[PDB]
């Protein structure tokens, strides 16, 4: 299990983060998103509610994991360790490649 | 245009005596701008209060903001709590 | 630097006098912003090729 340091403060997110889609490597807590502490450049449309909990038995591939996999492939173009940790680190390289194919 | 500014600050004096209601770090977090209060998250996209059709000076004091926010009716919620057990 | 705080979770039915942990504090009221949502951008803006 990873830890997700909330951006714009130092807090730890409990079980729900809010991923940003234009800086693409930030997160937020719920309370910093309810009040709008994420800077006047962003617009509260580009924040997807992602979870942090360990999901169910493998080879289910919820839409959160598919989205983060495709975010990783748009990020790195290679480097399947850096894809598999960005999925969440509870999936192997040899399964992320078997799911993208 | 930078991204990685700090935009939160902490004062050194521990004033943590009457502060259990604010947002604590775990001290008190002090941001660089205020908060934003949003009444209702979901817009109600039809409703000629908002859609403004082109057919046919009048005022109307509607009850609350809850008209504009897609609330479910209670008979469905009782039906679903009956389906609970 | 001119800082700000979070929203106090004091209810609307509290009626107590306003206590202050510091007398160098000040208090302000936040007017909620409310109108037809400004036209959000399309999904081509949110998630283009980088």
């Amino acid at each position: 299990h990873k830890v997700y340091i909330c951006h714009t403060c130092g807090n730890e997110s409990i079980n729900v983060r809010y991923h940003n889609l234009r800086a693409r490597d930030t997160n937020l807590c719920s309370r910093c998103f309810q009040e709008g502490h994420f800077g006047a450049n962003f617009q509260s449309s580009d924040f997807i509610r992602l979870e942090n909990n360990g999901n169910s038995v493998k080879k289910n591939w919820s839409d959160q994991e598919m989205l983060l996999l495709l975010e990783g492939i748009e990020m790195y173009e290679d480097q399947w360790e850096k894809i598999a940790d960005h999925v969440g680190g509870h999936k192997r390289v040899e399964d992320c490649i078997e799911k993208f194919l | 245009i930078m991204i990685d500014a700090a935009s939160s600050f902490v004062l050194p004096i521990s004033i943590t005596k009457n502060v259990d209601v604010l947002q604590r770090t775990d001290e008190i977090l002090w941001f660089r701008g205020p908060s934003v209060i949003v009444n209702e998250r979901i817009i109600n996209s039809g409703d000629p209060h908002l859609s403004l059709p082109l057919n046919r000076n009048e005022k109307e004091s509607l009850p609350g903001p809850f008209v504009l926010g897609l609330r479910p009716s209670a008979k469905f919620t009782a039906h679903r709590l009956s389906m609970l057990r | 630097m001119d800082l700000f705080s979070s929203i106090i979770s004091k209810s609307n039915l509290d009626k107590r006098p306003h206590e202050l942990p510091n007398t160098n504090f000040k208090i302000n009221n936040v007017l909620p912003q409310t109108d037809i949502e400004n036209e959000a951008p399309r999904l081509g803006f949110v998630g283009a090729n980088t």
């Binding site: 990873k2 997700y4 340091i5 490597d25 930030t26 | 004062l11 | 630097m1 160098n24």
Partner: peptide, 29 residues
């Protein structure tokens, strides 16, 4: 009180993204 410069909390972007939570993989004595 007006001479009380505040402490910035820096986020350090690589810490915000994916930090996990070595002898506990027993291959190194």
């Amino acid at each position: 009180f007006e001479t009380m410069v505040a402490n910035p909390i820096k986020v350090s972007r690589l810490q915000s993204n994916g930090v996990l939570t070595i002898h506990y993989s027993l291959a190194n004595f």
